[PDB]
Amino acid sequence: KIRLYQFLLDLLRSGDMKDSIWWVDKDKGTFQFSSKHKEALAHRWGIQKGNRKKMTYQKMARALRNYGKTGEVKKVKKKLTYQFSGEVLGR
DNA sequence: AATAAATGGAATGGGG
DNA sequence: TCCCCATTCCATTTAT
């Protein structure tokens, strides 16, 4: 099964949900979600995973928070903005 | 207040 | 057994 950070990186690479997520500074790996259109992206994550309940942005962001310590994704001090690690970006 | 976002502990569920 | 990689639930705090 695909990991959440890889799902998000793949979306950014494909441009399939450009109104829900975008690079802010792609060289640094910073990206941001749409305030108004993030829920459609969260729904897609839950469906891809086959989860029991409907996925929400809040639950997706709760999973993103768990990457902070291991480092794959960190929260940036702007709203709805995160940053991939260099290791994630290279792979 | 209404609306949104953030913080994050804890219980529960996946697939080895 | 017990870690992986989340998902789900819930209470609380901050937004300037």
Side-chain angles (χ1 to χ4, degrees), chain A residues 19-32:
Chain A
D19 293 347
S20 299
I21 194 182
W22 48 80
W23 294 116
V24 180
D25 184 332
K26 61 193 175 183
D27 285 20
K28 294 183 182 155
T30 58
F31 63 97
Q32 176 181 50

Side-chain angles (χ1 to χ4, degrees), chain A residues 46-47 50-56 59:
Chain A
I47 288 165
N51 291 335
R52 173 174 77 81
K53 309 265 295 192
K54 173 173 275 210
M55 177 58 59
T56 64
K59 285 186 299 185

Side-chain angles (χ1 to χ4, degrees), chain A residues 19-81:
Chain A
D19 293 347
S20 299
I21 194 182
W22 48 80
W23 294 116
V24 180
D25 184 332
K26 61 193 175 183
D27 285 20
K28 294 183 182 155
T30 58
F31 63 97
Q32 176 181 50
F33 296 96
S34 171
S35 175
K36 266 189 63 51
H37 301 295
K38 63 198 186 301
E39 295 296 342
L41 182 157
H43 293 159
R44 181 175 173 165
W45 169 237
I47 288 165
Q48 179 156 142
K49 283 291 295 290
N51 291 335
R52 173 174 77 81
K53 309 265 295 192
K54 173 173 275 210
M55 177 58 59
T56 64
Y57 183 79
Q58 181 165 14
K59 285 186 299 185
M60 192 184 71
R62 180 67 188 84
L64 284 180
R65 180 174 293 281
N66 292 334
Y67 291 133
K69 291 303 178 173
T70 45
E72 291 90 348
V73 186
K74 294 176 181 286
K75 181 85 186 72
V76 168
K77 294 299 191 180
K78 302 116 82 187
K79 291 189 184 171
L80 307 176
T81 305

Side-chain angles (χ1 to χ4, degrees), chain A residues 2-14:
Chain A
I2 185 167
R3 294 187 74 171
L4 173 59
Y5 72 80
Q6 190 62 54
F7 168 84
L8 296 174
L9 184 62
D10 291 345
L11 283 184
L12 282 158
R13 290 212 238 266
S14 72

